C-alpha cells in the first residue's frame with residue numbers, strides 16, 4: 001500500500017500534538033500509521049525553529065500538510081507563517097483540520113473561521129476554495145467520543161483522497177548528477193553517478209546540463225560494475241558512456257537528463273536557514289553581497305546573496321528569503337535543496353523557491 | 357582470487373576516506389573496481405552490533421592478486437568499536453598519516469588498538485605529500501611513524517611507507533596516481549593472505565550435553581573452524597583438565613553425517629565419556645591446537661547506558677562475568693597503572709583472572725556481563741602464564 005509523508009502545521013496550542021495522537025489511536029516526533037489504502041509517516045515538531053528546519057532540511061520532505069486551526073482562536077500569526085513556509089519549500093497540498101469545535105458550536109462562528117482560513121490559504125497560492133476543511137475535536141476524539149472519532153476518520157478520508165501519492169522516482173524524467181568522469185583503459189570515457197530519477201537505456205538521448213552550454217548526445221553504455229549492462233534506474237550507481245564525449249566534454253556537477261526536462265539557471269530565490277555555531281555554522285550573520293559556495297547535488301558554485309529590501313543581516317538560527325546569483329549555471333528546479341558552505345563549514349541550508 | 361579484509365586507520369582528517377575513494381577510482385580505471393563516491397563512503401551507514409551503533413563504509417576492489425573488502429569509518433569512536441567488536445576482523449590495515457601534521461593521538465591509539473586486536477600487518481600511506489616538499493620534514497615524519505609502530509611491536513624498520521597524495525590521485529594526476537599503485541603493491545606483498553576457517557584446526561564450542569540411547573554421549577554445538585568426523589581424535593578443553601578421546605559419530609537433525617564442517621550445527625558423540633564428563637563452555641578441538649588459561653590481558657569497550665550497558669563507572673577489582681563463546685565465567689579485573697575508574701563508553705586495557713580456565717587464544721572475543729546484561733565487549737590481547 002503506498003507511503004506518504006505528511007505532518008501537522010499551524011499555530012502553537014491549536015492542537016497538532018493532540019491531533020497527531022488522536023489520529024494514531026483512531027486507525028520532530030515521528031509516527032507512522034495507516035489508512036485502508038495508504039501508509040503514512042507523520043511529523044509533529046514542538047514549535048518555532050523545528051518547523052523551519054524540518055521544512056528546509058528534514059529527513060522526509062512533506063508530500064502534504066495538515067494545517068490545524070483552532071475554531072476558538074481563528075488563524076493566528078504562526079498559521080500564516082506556516083502557510084507561507086509551505087509555499088516557500090514546495091509542500092504540494094494542504095488539508096485543514098478545524099480543531100476545538102467542541103468549544104465552538106455556533107455554526108455562524110465556524111463559517112467565519114472557515115472563510116478566513118480559505119482566504120489566508122489563497123493569499124499564498126494554495127487553492128483556498130478547494131481545500132478540504134474538516135471540523136473536529138482532537139481532544140474529544142482522543143478521549144473516545146464516537147462523534148469526534150468519526151471526524152478523524154473524515155480527516156483521514158480527505159487526506160487519502162485529496163493529497164495525491166507522490167510520483168515515484170522511477171517515473172520521473174531521467175536525471176543523474178555526474179559524480180566523476182574518467183577514462184577506463186582500453187575503453188573510453190565514463191561519467192559516473194547515482195541515478196536520482198527515472199530510467200536510462202543504451203540508445204537514449206540525454207542532455208548534459210549545467211556549468212556550460214547544454215549539449216545533447218546518445219547513451220552508448222550503462223554499467224553497474226560486474227552486475228548490469230544496458231540500463232539503469234533511480235538508485236543505481238552506474239558508469240555511463242556517451243557518444244563523442246571526452247573528459248573535456250562532461251564534468252562533475254553537470255547532470256545527465258532527459259532532453260528538455262531540466263534547464264540551467266544562475267539566478268533564483270530561495271528560502272534559507274542559517275546554521276548556528278552549535279550546528280556547525282558560523283556565529284556571524286549573512287549580509288548583502290556575501291559570496292559563499294552553493295552545493296547543488298555534486299558540485300559547488302560561488303554565488304552572491306541579496307537579502308530582502310531593508311534587511312542588512314540574517315543571524316544564525318534565523319531564516320529568510322534570499323536572492324542568489326551564481327557565477328556558473330547549474331541545473332535546478334523549484335523545490336531543489338542545497339547547502340551553503342564557506343571554508344569547511346556548512347553555514348546555510350536552502351531550498352529553491354523560485355527561478356528568475 | 358584470495359579474499360582479504362582491510363581498512364584505513366589513522367587520525368581524523370588525515371585523509372582516510374579520500375584515500376579509500378582514490379583507491380576505488382584508480383582501480384576502476386583498470387576495470388578492477390566500482391568507483392565509489394567520497395561523499396557516499398564518508399556518510400557511512402549505521403551497522404548494529406547488538407545495541408551498539410557503528411558508522412561503517414564498505415568498499416570492494418581487486419588488484420592483479422587479490423580481492424579486498426575495505427572498511428573505512430568516520431569517527432574515532434567508530435574505529436574503537438569496529439576493531440574490538442565489528443563484523444569483520446582486519447587481515448591488515450592501511451595507516452594514513454598526514455605528512456603535514458605528523459602522528460597525532462588517534463595515530464597512536466589506532467596502532468595500539470591494532471596491536472591489541474591482533475591486526476597482522478600495517479602498511480603506511482604518508483598522505484598530503486603535495487603540501488610538503490621539504491625532504492627534511494618528510495624523513496622526520498617517517499622516523500616518527502616508524503618509532504611509533506615499533507613501540508607497539510610492529511616491525512617499524514620493515515614496514516612500507518608510501519609518500520603520496522590521496523587528493524591529487526582522486527583528481528586524476530598521473531604521478532600521484534602512481535603512488536596508489538605503489539600502495540596496492542605494498543598491500544599485496546606485506547599483508548598476508550588469511551587462512552580459511554575450514555583449513556584451520558577443528559574447533560566447536562559445546563552448547564549442550566546429553567545421552568542418546570543407542571548412540572552415546574553427545575556434545576552439541578556449531579562448528580567454528582575445520583571439520584569433524586567419526587574416528588577423529590579431539591580434545592575437550594576448558595573448565596577442567598583437558599581430556600582426549602575419539603569422535604564416535606556426528607549427527608545433524610538426528611541423522612548421522614559423513615562429516616561436520618565449519619558452519620554446521622551438530623551433535624558430536626564422544627568415546628568413553630559420560631554426561632558429567634563434558635559441559636557447556638568447553639570446546640572440542642584438534643588435539644594440541646588450543647590450551648586452557650585463566651589469566652589474560654584484553655582490550656575492552658565499555659558500553660554506554662544508551663547501548664544497554666552500565667550507567668556508572670567501575671573500579672579496580674570489578675568482578676563481573678566473562679562470556680566466552682557459550683558460557684560465563686567469573687573474573688577479576690586489574691586495571692593498568694594510572695587507570696583507576698572506567699566510565700560507560702570508555703575503552704581500556706585490563707588484566708583478567710578467571711575463576712576457571714577457558715580455552716583461549718589471542719584474538720578471542722568475549723562479552724562482559726552483569727545481572728544478565730552485556731556491559732562490555734572485549735578481545736583477548738595477550739595470554740599471561
Ligand SMILES: Nc1nc2c(ncn2[C@@H]2O[C@H](COP(=O)(O)OP(=O)(O)O)[C@@H](O)[C@H]2O)c(=O)[nH]1
Nearest residue numbers: 012013014015016017018100103137138139140
Ligand atoms: N477543547 C479542546 N482542547 C484541545 C483540543 N485539542 C487539543 N486541545 C488542548 O489545547 C492545548 C494545546 O494542545 P496541543 O496538541 O499541545 O497544541 P500544539 O501546540 O498545536 O501541539 C492542550 O491542552 C490540548 O489538550 C480539542 O479538540 N478541544
Ligand SMILES: Nc1nc2c(ncn2[C@@H]2O[C@H](COP(=O)(O)OP(=O)(O)O)[C@@H](O)[C@H]2O)c(=O)[nH]1
Nearest residue numbers: 367368369370371372373374483484521522523
Ligand atoms: N592537500 C591534500 N589534502 C587532502 C589530501 N587527502 C585528503 N585531503 C583533504 O583533507 C581533508 C580530510 O580528508 P578525509 O579523507 O575526509 O580525512 P579522514 O577523516 O581521515 O577520512 C579533506 O579536505 C580532504 O580533501 C591530500 O593528499 N592532499
Ligand SMILES: [Mg+2]
Nearest residue numbers: 016017045046
Ligand atoms: Mg505540539
Ligand SMILES: [Mg+2]
Nearest residue numbers: 372373429430
Ligand atoms: Mg573519513
